[PDB]
């Protein structure tokens, strides 16, 4: 059975909701963006109407085979009309296809569903700008004070100014970088372009990135892998083990890897600078973690909220817990204390 947080109040439309069977009363089915733990349910047997993006709708044709007449793909930015009640999406700044929804409600109520987000300052001028919002469906997974990371720049800096400096000391280093779901992909891409290679991989990771309409993709990468000095590899095998059986694979072309694993938030971060990140090392292999987040710090998200001023916040993460949840509404009081709203 759906959960509350899953329903919108006074529509028949459901968020992210694809894993409890034929949910009563729902007409039109949203999904914010294609991640497993959203998507969970989704297959070509599914027989009701999914709204989403562009690109979410391309992974859905082509790795679920969802048919085509089922799958409602909008533009963003843009007002649209769906079952009688206006809709928009917006850009989330989580992983390709990523969106919020903006749904006006028929008695005069505005809600916004971020979806899974990283909350940004040009959100402040997006449509967002133009009327107020009553209720906010919010993605807290790092809402505690905490959760502290670099901003991606940063951390884009640190990878491409590490991997080059590697490959250029010895240049039969290979470049290994960790994945398991779409997103994260300026970090394979920005080492492959200071580098001047492609970047190499399985035939099912290469369907994928070829759904996300990146601009000049068949440039940027390959499953060719004998023609690249930069590998994806699934993040499971991002292991002095693991990488030690790669490294046998590719037929004495290279001596030495160096592998990233983009995580999110981790401990080290409670204590070291970006600046200050060092790998594990064991023989000629090298890992290093580094906090690339697709969702807001906690900064970031107290930011976006004080801004929008809502009139009642409800959690989309983290509601397991009683814990969890109180801690959470602690925040919102506080923040709303300190804004006057
Ligand atoms: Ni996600």
Redesign the pocket.
Same mark, same amino acid.
């Given at each position: 059975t759906c959960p509350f947080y899953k329903k919108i109040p006074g529509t028949g439309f459901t968020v992210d909701a694809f894993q409890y069977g034929v949910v009563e009363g729902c007409t039109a089915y949203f999904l914010? +963006?294609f991640?497993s !733990? +959203?998507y969970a349910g989704l297959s070509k047997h599914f027989t009701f109407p999914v709204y989403c993006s562009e690109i979410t709708g391309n992974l859905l044709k082509n790795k679920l085979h969802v048919q085509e007449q089922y799958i409602h793909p909008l533009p963003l930015d843009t007002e649209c009309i769906v079952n009688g009640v206006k809709v928009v999406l917006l850009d989330a700044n +989580?992983?390709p296809g990523?969106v919020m929804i903006l749904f006006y409600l028929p008695n005069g109520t505005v809600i916004l569903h971020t %979806? !899974?987000f990283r909350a940004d300052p040009s959100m402040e001028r997006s449509l967002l700008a133009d009327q107020k919002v009553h209720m906010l469906y919010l !993605?807290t997974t790092y809402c505690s004070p905490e959760y502290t990371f670099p901003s991606q720049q940063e951390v884009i800096r640190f990878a491409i100014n590490t991997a080059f400096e590697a490959v250029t000391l010895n240049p039969h280093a290979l470049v290994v970088c960790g994945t398991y779901?779409i %997103?994260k992909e300026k970090v394979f891409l920005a080492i492959a372009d200071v580098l001047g290679s492609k970047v190499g991989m399985s035939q099912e990771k290469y369907k994928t990135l070829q759904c996300l309409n990146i601009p000049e993709i068949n440039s940027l990468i390959t499953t060719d892998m004998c023609s690249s000095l930069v590998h994806l590899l699934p993040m499971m095998q991002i292991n002095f083990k693991g990488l030690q059986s790669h490294l046998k694979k590719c037929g004495g072309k290279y001596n030495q890897i160096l592998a990233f694993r983009p995580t999110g938030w981790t401990h080290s971060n409670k204590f070291t600078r970006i600046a200050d990140v060092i790998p594990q090392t064991k023989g000629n292999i090298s890992i290093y973690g580094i906090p690339y987040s697709?969702?807001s710090s906690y900064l970031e998200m107290k930011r976006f909220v004080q801004w929008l001023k809502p009139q009642k916040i409800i959690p989309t993460v983290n509601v397991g817990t009683w814990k969890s949840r109180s801690t959470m509404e602690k925040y919102f009081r506080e923040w709303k204390l300190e804004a006057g709203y």
């Open positions: 914010t +963006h991640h !733990d +959203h +989580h992983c990523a %979806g !899974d !993605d779901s %997103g697709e969702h």
